[model samples]
Target chain A: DLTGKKIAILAADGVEEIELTSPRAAIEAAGGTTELISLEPGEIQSMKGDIEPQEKYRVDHVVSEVQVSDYDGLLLPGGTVNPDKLRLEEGAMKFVRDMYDAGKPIAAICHGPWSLSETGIAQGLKMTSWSSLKRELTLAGAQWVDEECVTDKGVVTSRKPDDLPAFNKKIVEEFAEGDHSSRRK
Target chain B: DLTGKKIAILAADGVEEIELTSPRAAIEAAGGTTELISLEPGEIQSMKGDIEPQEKYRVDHVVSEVQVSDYDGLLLPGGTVNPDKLRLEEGAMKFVRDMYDAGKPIAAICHGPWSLSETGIAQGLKMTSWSSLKRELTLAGAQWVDEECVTDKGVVTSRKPDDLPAFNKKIVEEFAEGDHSSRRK
Candidate 1:
């Protein structure tokens, strides 16, 4: 059980509603507390597809205001615009980088790893993301694979929403194992 | 009969796959030729929910290279990123403008109307799109309605994928009626 563990879910408007919901449900069922972190306060517009509007989720923490150390793990759920918007935000990118540097378990799926591809921590890591990101991840110095899930140096990555089962399980394991600070190069 | 009619479906990565496929199939079955046009050559990524990548639709024409006059009608499919990407491209906007000016039938649904909202032609026109776009459409000087479908002059609009059946039927009717150049202000 992940009792007492806090997980940060970084997302914004246009987030794949199910991707976030599935993993959040999984994490919660594992006895972990999940917080929705976004660019602004109030509700973050969720989407069924990158286009279809879904229910909005209340934000628990603002990226600019939350401390990276407050969470035990970080979860990045992909929607085309969610991670795309996050990658462009200085606060979002910093949160990802700090989480990685601290060796807190990080799990990203679908377009979620896009933020990881931009952060300096992606270099030299083996990860999987939405197939379209293969070239970007490769160029970012990360070894991109097309597997259901890949865990390298405490970071867990999956291809898309379909791989959420594997992603959720792996991230939970990584979280249970604790920090991999020495894995940082 | 639409044996000699050619319809252009203008889209790009992240297009709502069903929005494009449903109408394309219906139009082609109605004896019309449908061409997939995008900002680039080759394949354009399609999405299930604006998040999960579906299949890559082959591009028949690139926005910058195609002449608006070559097609009898234009179809725009919605997905958050599809129109978001298209609206940012000068060539795409010009293509929409040219089609509008030529008075060719133009049909769009869901977020598909986002691009149309950017085109000055939408001013004072009656239209419907995914409800989320209502404010944007209103600010663009269009009378946004919540109907299943709306046809004004020669432009056909629909709310979402659920309204596709109506959208397809109306568009076919609009196309059969030919150019509405005289309806322009």
Candidate 2:
């Protein structure tokens, strides 16, 4: 049970609404508290696909205002533009790196892994992402596979909304499993 | 009547779906033809505000391949990120400038005017736009106002989606007016 666990959901505007919500709902259902973290304060818009913008989700903390240690696990939700924008922000990159360095469980879906791939943590790791990102992840030294979900060193990832079920289930398991420090072995 | 007149609807991904559809429907209803023009070929995504992603609009023509002379009028639709991305594109700015220079009727709503202002055509014009853009338009030399719709020298402007009815009606009238050379006086 994640009764007292806190999960950091890091996202920005243009995030795929379902990608964020599915995992978030799952985390909460497992008795974890999920705090939405973003580049700014207030709300961030969510998208249905690369085009359709959906509802706004409230941000519980800003990237610069919180550290990786504040949460027990990290959740990254992807929208084509969401991760595209976050990967370019210095503070966002630092946040991702810090979480990885702490050996905490990190769950990302669709384009969510864009920022993580940039932090050089995916090197030599086996993972999967949106098909469009295969080449990029490979260049980052990740063995990108075509699968619904992949977990390596406590880092969990899934391809798109269609894989949300698998993603949510796996992330919850990973988050509950806690730190996987021995993966570096 | 705009019996044989051709109108160009220039947009990109992140456009407000209704802003584009409403005006396009109105133009077609008035016996005019409308073409979807964009920076790249294929489909561009539309949004409902900064939230819901709506539809994928097919590009009728590529920007670099079309010119202002090909259309009798122009329509600029708005969305938070749509115009934000367009104004930064060289081809899009040139398209707006060309339309303005030729004195063709142009209608812009919400954040759509971002590209128009960047083209230096908002100068000395009276217009209305989404409330957040009042300062930007005024700084662009436009006499900004708060209204459902405003028309000056064949340039039609509206505040937001709530103002679409007036915007469509006035744009149809302005577009049918052919040219507003006399309004320059």
Candidate 3:
């Protein structure tokens, strides 16, 4: 039913590289449209422990030019630096907050919740992340759970790459039904 | 070093429409070769949000018969159902994981990680996802971060559709370098 529905994938400076990619493929395979949106218009860099660096991806639309209302869902991947840098960007954070505030389904994995914390949207949202991030999610007013996979309201979460399998399932199930019970009303 | 590297892009019944197309184009543009591998040979079904599905690509290899080492690298795309279904097959998981364990560079976007996770090779790697599974990665021993794109070892991850430029860049960089880090221990 999501045919031709546009989905946005958001990121900035540092983010877990695979978290963004794996699920993206999952979405596209399902026939949904995906767009890579970022704070800037150029390539985005990826890093590992701040040592080895990877090349960038093109931005389909800049955060400043796009509206949350245009997309069906949003995705945020975790990278220690990716979310940290995005959380600091005022415009980018606002877009994310707006997407969630509109009652649209959003997806976040790993440290991506850091950006969600800034929007105050995580409050009352049940989710999961790297166990080390539990405190941060709790502080953001969101309930944290330790599980291979969880679907809160329309939001879906998984622990790590290991959870990609389950995480992939949750997203497809939700996208298909347009209802992931775990979403906050 | 990867100037003429042939890459195999894995897909199946629910493969992400974009993930498979976009990255394949990126790799070819970067001077590398790419082949679409799948569980079933020939054309496969693709969906958009599980509601309206389409048939887009022709499979290059059937999962059971593919020689994991034949290609220089493996590309996984995100299509919620595609990865989820692929994970259930042991042969599929082993092929992808063996590729990773062999240290062949892995370039994945969105839900593509679902299959990668089944391989159990993403431990300690930084990555990005569709934002919902941050919690799963942490429990699985991944260091979560946020940014447009991230590179760990030889893995390249991006936040979403907008990060395609970065996504493509990193793929080329990784292919060009042929190895993740120059400082070999």
Model 2 docking category:
incorrect
DockQ of each: 0.09, 0.10, 0.02
Candidate 1 lDDT tens digits, A96-156: 9999888898998887887887776668999888765564566567888889999999888
Compared with the true structure, what per-residue lDDT tens digits does model 2 show for residues A7-48? 998898888889888888888898998999899899998877
Share of reference contacts kept by candidate 2: 0.20
Better of 1 and 3 by lDDT: 1
Question: What are the runs in model 1 whose C-alpha is more than 4 Å off?
Answer: A1-34, A37-185
- Point to the candidate with the largest DockQ: 2
TM-score of chain A of 2: 0.97
Docking class of 3: incorrect
Q: What TM-score does the predicted chain A of each candidate obtain versus native chain A?
A: 0.97, 0.97, 0.89
Q: Scored by Cα lDDT, where does model 2 land?
A: 0.83
lDDT tens digits by residue: candidate 1, B1-185: 46789999999888989999999988887889999989999998887756657888899879888998799999999876888678768899899999999989999998888778777767899999876566456756788899999999789999888898898889888887888899875
Judge the docking of candidate 1 as incorrect, acceptable, medium or high: incorrect
TM-score, candidate 1, is: 0.57
- List model 3 lDDT by residue over A18-112, tens digit each: 77778888888888878889888887765443223455667788899998768878888776556756765778988987777666777777767
